[PDB]
Each structure stands twice: as C-alpha cells, then as structure tokens.
C-alpha cells in the first residue's frame, strides 16, 4: 500500500 | 534565476541543477485532458464610463456571481473584467524555498481580499488514470503530492505538468481558498486570497487533504490551531480520496 499520498479537496 | 526563467526551459533546467529554482515540470497555460469528455446581462459601459474608471462585469455581473467567466461575446467585449482565467490575469507571485515544506509561493506585492492568484492547472485524470498515478508516485517514493479534486470523476494532477500554483503550501489558518469556475462550459480551479495579503507573505490554502497513505506527513504551517498532520486524524481509502 502507498506509504504516502492523498488528494486535495476544493472547499471555501 | 528570476520568475521569468520558468518561461525559459534551457535556463530553468540549469538553475534547477544549481538548486536556485525548483525541479523542471511542463509549464501549461490551461488544463490538459488525458481522456477527452451564455452571455451576461450587464449594460455595456460607454467610452466615457471606461475613461472615468468604471469596472465592466464587476460586482453585479450575473456570470461572476455564479462563478462563470464571460466569453469574447460579452456585451462589454474587451473591457470585461470577468475573463481572468482566460486572460491569465494572475497576481504578482514568487517561488521561494521554505525551511521544511519544500518550495512555496509568496505575494510579490500587496494583494487585496478576494484577489485571483493563479489557476491550479494540470493533467485532468479519470479514476483509472488516478489509480495508475497513485501506484507510479508510490513506486517512485514521491514526497510531494499534486492531486486536486475537480469533479467526482476528474482529478487535476500537477505533478508533471502545471503552473506555479503547484507550489502553494498547506495552512491550517490560510490566506487563500480555492474557487471552482466555469470557463467555456469546462470547470477550472483557481486560488483566491481570503484576506489582505501583504507583500512577501507566503500564499497558503487549506488542502482539506484526503490522505490514502499508510503514514501521515507532519504539518509545518505553524498556526496556533495547526492540525499536526496533512490529512488530519483519519486515513481514507484510495477510491474515497479519488471521489468515488
Ligand atoms: N503545511 C505543510 N506542512 C508540511 N509539508 C507541506 C505543507 N504544505 C505543503 N507541504 C508539502 O508540499 C506537498 C504539496 S505540493 C506544494 C508544493 C511543494 N512544497 C513543492 O516543493 O513542490 C505536500 O505533499 C507536502 O510534502
Ligand atoms: Zn457581465
Ligand atoms: Zn463580461
Ligand atoms: Zn498546520
């Protein structure tokens, strides 16, 4: 499984 | 090695070898898709109103209110102040080296509140391409991640291609926010200041990072309300991170 990683989510 | 060297790939590559500029990526002026998928009602300003300093398609523009940019067919034509993404009306910014976050971005002049900074450009991916890249970046042992959710089945990846918005670091107490804009019936993400940002201040946004990784990266924003880690407390699955 990836040691690191993620996704940024647009929010206000 | 100035900001202008980003437009000069031969000089930028040299600056990167000497550690004076960040590593090379491809500079793109708009989003690239790996797998491909109206006018406002403002009264046109007269020549005299334009001369007097009147804004065209400003605060009362129907398109702007709905986060829609105007096209070349706008009743205000050339004067339209609501085509910032298209006209690359980016704020004056600088790429800086931070102490422990890698490279970053800072205001090169004072920026008022709700000022367009830059568009978050990159390669738009579907769920299958996103999963391919998740494995690629994990296999490469990449430290930095550049995935920005656009819409449920669209991820903007600025790892290989993008612009200097790929240098905006996270903050638990930010001075920018993302806004999703409709430009030519296509959605785009841009960074906008949320407050007055003095010259020389680092430009930051709240990632609302969905960490799929086994391990969390520590947050070095230095806010009195810092969450300690990029992603917060929870680890989500890859499908959830990818918007499924
Ligand atoms: N507040 C923060 N604390 C620690 N690392 C941060 C951070 N904000 C951003 N980063 C780092 O920057 C990555 C997002 S990409 C932002 C540009 C990056 N610093 C670069 O040098 O190219 C993250 O995956 C993380 O490694
Ligand atoms: Zn208008
Ligand atoms: Zn307009
Ligand atoms: Zn923090």
SS3 readout for chain B: CCHHHHHCHHHHHHHHHCCCCCCCCEECCCCEECCCCCCCCCCCCCHHHHHCCCCECCCCCHHHHCCECCCCCCCCHHHECCCCCCCCCCCCEEEEECCCCCEEEEECCCECCCCEEEECCCEEECHHHHHHHHHHHHHCCCCCCCEEEEECCEEEECCCEECHHHHCEECCCCCEEEEEEEECCEEEEEEEECCCECCCCECEECCCCEECCCCCEECCCCCCCCCCEECCCCCCCHHHHCCC
Alpha carbon distance B122, B133 (integer Å): 13
Domain that holds residue B74: 1-244
What whole-number distance in Å separates Cα of residue B1 and Cα of residue B11? 8
Number of domains in chain B: 1
| Residues B146 and B116 sit within 8 Å (Cβ to Cβ) | no
Residue with tokens 């102040």: B81
Contact between residue B25 and residue B39 where contact means Cβ atoms under 8 Å apart = no
In contact, B176 and B208? CB cutoff 8 Å: no
Can you tell me the distance from the alpha carbon of B130 to that of B134, in angstroms, rounded to the nearest whole number?
6
B190 is in an annotated binding site: no
CB B221 within 8 A of CB A9: no
Q: How far is the C-alpha of B59 from the C-alpha of B82, rounded, in Å?
A: 10
Q: Which residue has the tokens 């990784």?
A: B213
Question: What distance in Å separates the CA atoms of residue B101 and residue B61, rounded to the nearest whole number?
Answer: 39
Place of tokens 């334009």: B50
- φ and ψ at residue B192, rounded to 5 degrees: -135, 135
Q: Which residues pair with B29 in a beta bridge?
A: none
Structure token digits, residue B209:
């990072």
Which experimental approach was used here?
A: X-ray
List the structure tokens of B78. Answer: 């050339």
Q: Is B9 left (phi over 0), alpha (psi -120 to 50) or beta?
A: alpha
Chain B nearest CA to A7, separation (Å): 5
Q: How many residues does chain A have?
A: 12
Q: Which of B15, B19, B11, B3 is nearest to B107 (CA)?
A: B3
CA distance B122 to B148: 9
Interface touch A5/B213, C-beta < 8 Å: yes
Q: Which two tokens stand for residue B176?
A: 């920018």
**Contacting A residues, span 1-12, partner chain B, CB-CB under 8 Å:** 1-12
Reported for B13-17, long-range contacts at CB under 8 A and 24+ positions apart, including other chains, are none
- B123 C-beta neighbours (distance < 10 Å), count: 21
| B157 CB-near residues (< 8 Å, 6+ apart) | B122, B123, B124, B125, B130, B133, B146, B147, B148
Cα B193 to middle of ligand 4, angstroms:
18
From chain A, the residues in CB contact with B138 under 8 A are 2-5
């Amino acid at each position: 499984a990836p040691r690191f990683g993620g996704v940024m989510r647009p929010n206000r | 090695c100035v900001m202008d060297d980003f437009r000069d790939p031969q000089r930028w590559k040299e600056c990167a070898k000497q550690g004076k500029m960040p590593c090379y990526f491809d500079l793109i002026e708009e989003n690239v898709y790996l797998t491909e998928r109206m006018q406002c009602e403002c009264t046109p300003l007269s020549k005299d109103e334009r001369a007097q300093g009147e804004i065209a398609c400003g605060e009362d523009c129907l398109n702007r209110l709905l986060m829609i940019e105007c096209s070349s067919r706008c009743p205000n034509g050339d004067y339209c102040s609501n085509r910032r993404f298209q006209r690359k009306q980016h704020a004056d910014v600088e790429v800086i080296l931070t102490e422990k976050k890698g490279w970053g971005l800072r205001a090169a002049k004072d920026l008022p509140s709700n000022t367009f900074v830059l568009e978050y450009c990159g390669e738009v991916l579907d769920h299958k391409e996103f999963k391919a890249r998740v494995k690629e970046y994990a296999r490469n042992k990449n430290i930095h991640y550049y995935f920005m959710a656009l819409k449920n089945d669209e991820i903007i990846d600025a790892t290989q291609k993008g612009n200097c918005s790929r240098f905006m670091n996270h903050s638990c107490e930010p001075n920018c926010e993302t806004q999703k804009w409709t430009v030519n019936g296509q959605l785009r993400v841009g960074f906008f200041t949320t407050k007055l940002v003095p010259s020389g201040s680092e430009l930051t946004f709240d990632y609302q990072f969905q960490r799929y990784g086994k391990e969390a990266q520590k947050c070095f924003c230095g806010s009195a309300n810092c969450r300690g880690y990029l992603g917060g407390e929870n680890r989500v699955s890859i499908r959830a991170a990818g918007g499924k």
